[PDB]
Ligand binder design. Structure first.
Ligand SMILES: O=C(O)C1=C[C@@H](O)[C@@H](O)[C@H](O)C1
Lengths: 171, 171, 171, 171
C-alpha cells in the first residue's frame, strides 16, 4: 500500500515516443541495475535530448525490431531522466540472461573519453532511490556495468570508473 | 561528503553562486510553501538557467544588500531545481509574517502571459515531495501562492491558475 | 579429469530450494574451503534435513534479502550433502576477501556442544575429494575454519577441534 | 546550541589498543547502527573489561589480519564504552553492505541466555544519543540487530529481545 511520489521522469508522450508493443513483465522487486551508454550523440538541453531519446527508440524499433526503446530509462546530459520501458516491463539491453532480471538505464552519449555532467549522474542516482522507494528495486539492489555482464565497451571507460564508486556497485 | 540524491537539486557551487552569508535558521518542519515567479528573463537550458540563477542572486546581493538570494529554491524551465537557501535557512521572498514559517520556491520567468513547462511543474511538486522525506516539509504542507500572501501579481496569472489545481493547496 | 560420479549431493529441487538469483562465478580450481556450522537446530533425517536446508535458505533469502542461501554446500546429520550454490557460484559465507577464492561448506546444527556424527564428517570429506576429482578444487586445497577468517564462534568448538586434525587444514 | 555534552568513553590508549591502521572512512551523518555481541566471555570491572577490548582486538588484528579491531565501539558490563574504530572509520562487523553505512557497537560477552546489566544498556543508549548530538548519526538513525543483516545468532536471543524494544529499532 505504498503510492507516494518519487522523482521526475520525462514521460513517453512528452518525448513523442512511438507506443510500446512490449508486454512481458519483470518480477518486483528487481535485484539488478545495468548501466550502459548509447555510444551515440550527446545532448545538453531538454529539446535536443528528447530528439535523441527519439532517435534511440527509433533505431531499436524501426531497425532492430524490438517492441520499444531497448532501455527501461535513458539519461540525458540535460540532467533529466527519460521514460523508457519503465519499471515493470523487461527491457532488451543486456542479453537474454540479464534482461529478465534487471533494469537497464543508459546514459545518452559515448563516455569513452568524456564523463557525463554531475546532473546526469545525479538524475541516474535519484532514479534508483525512487525505484527502491516504489518497491521496483530491492533495497539492496546491485549496480553493474554493461561490460561486466556482456562483452562491450559500454558504458565507456570513463563512466565505467565513475560508477564503480557508487554505493551499490558489485563487479 | 554527501551522497547525491533528493530531488536532483543543482548545488550552489554548480551554478557559480557567491557564498551565502545568512545565518537565520528555519524551524523544521515547516507548514507553508509559497510559490512565486521571479519576473525576470526565462531560460530553458541548464546553461541559460544557471546564468539566470546567478543573475537573480546577484541582484539580491550586490544591489538589495541581502545575505543571499531570497528564495529557498529556484525552478528553471529546463526542468531542474536550483538550490537557493535550501531547507534550513529562512528565506526572504514573502515578507516578515511568512518568511520565518514558509518555504519559498520561485519559477524563473514571467508567467503572466505564459506557463512553465510540465517539467518545471514536475521538478516543483517533486521538490516538495522530496522535502517531506527530509523532515524539511511536514507531510501535510499547505501551498499558498504569492498573491494569497502579499500584494503581488506574482507568480503570474497563468501560473497562478495552475497552482490552485495542486493537491496540498489551502488558500 | 576423469568421469567419476562422485558424491551423492541432494539437488536443490529435491530439498526444494527457492530458485537462486546469484550470477557471480568462482574460478576453478578453487584453492580454499571454509568450514562453518549454521549454529541452529539440527536434523538427522533426509526428511528433516531437507526441511532444515529450506529454513536456512529462507533465513538468508527472506530475512536477509540475499540471492540464495549463503553456503556452497550444507552437510546434514543425516549423512547427506545438500546443494547450496554448488561448485561454480561464489557463496556468501565468510566475507569479501575469502568468498571469491573459496568454497563454503556448512554443517547444519550448532557444534559448540556436540561433535557432528561420523556420517556427517564422512559426507564432508567425500564432498571434498569429489571436488578435487571434478577439478573444482586444487588437489592441494587448504581447509580453514570459519572463525579463522571472520570473528565467529562458527564452526563450533568440537568441530573446530576436529577440522584442525584434517590432512588439508592450514593455519 | 546546547554544547556537545556526551559520553565517557575509555579511549584506545587507556585500554592499550594496538595502533589502528585502518584508513577508510564513514560519511556523517551515519544512518544505521548495528548491535552485535562478542559471543565470548564477559567482564564486570574496568581492568577486566579493558583486558578484553585488548583480546578482541588481538583476535581481529593478529588472527584475522585486520587493520584494527572490528567494531566502532564495545560495551563492557562495567558500564563503560570502549573506543573501537570510533565514529569516522569504516568498521568490519556486518559485511560489505552495512559496514560502509553504519556504526557497529558490540557488547562484550554472550547474551543468548542472559542480558547485559542495566549499566551496560545505559552506556549503549547514552552512546547513541551522543552520536546524534555530535552529528555523527542521523537524528533519525535506525538500530538493526546483527542477525538482521548477517547470518549469526549475534547479539544473542535476550539482547536481541531488548533492542527490538528501542526507539530507533527497525527491521
Ligand atoms: O539526506 C538523505 O540522505 C536522504 C534521505 C531520504 O529522503 C532519501 O529519499 C534521499 O534520496 C536521501
Amino acid at each position: 500500500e505504498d503510492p507516494p511520489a518519487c522523482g521526475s521522469i520525462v514521460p513517453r508522450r512528452e518525448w513523442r515516443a512511438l507506443a510500446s508493443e512490449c508486454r512481458e513483465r519483470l518480477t518486483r522487486p528487481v535485484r539488478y541495475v545495468v548501466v550502459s551508454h548509447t555510444a551515440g550523440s550527446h545532448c545538453d538541453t531538454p529539446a535536443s535530448c528528447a530528439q535523441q531519446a527519439q532517435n534511440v527508440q527509433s533505431y531499436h524499433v524501426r531497425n532492430l525490431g524490438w517492441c520499444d526503446v531497448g532501455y527501461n530509462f535513458l539519461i540525458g546530459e540535460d540532467g533529466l531522466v527519460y521514460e523508457g520501458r519503465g519499471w515493470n516491463i523487461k527491457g532488451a539491453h543486456a542479453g537474454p540472461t540479464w534482461n529478465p532480471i534487471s533494469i537497464g538505464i543508459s546514459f545518452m552519449g559515448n563516455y569513452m573519453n568524456r564523463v557525463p555532467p554531475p546532473r546526469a549522474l545525479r538524475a541516474a542516482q535519484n532514479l534508483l532511490a525512487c525505484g527502491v522507494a516504489l518497491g521496483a528495486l530491492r533495497s539492496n539492489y546491485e549496480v553493474k556495468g554493461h561490460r561486466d555482464v556482456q562483452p562491450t565497451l559500454s558504458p565507456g571507460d570513463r563512466l565505467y570508473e565513475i560508477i564503480q564508486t557508487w554505493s551499490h556497485y558489485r563487479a
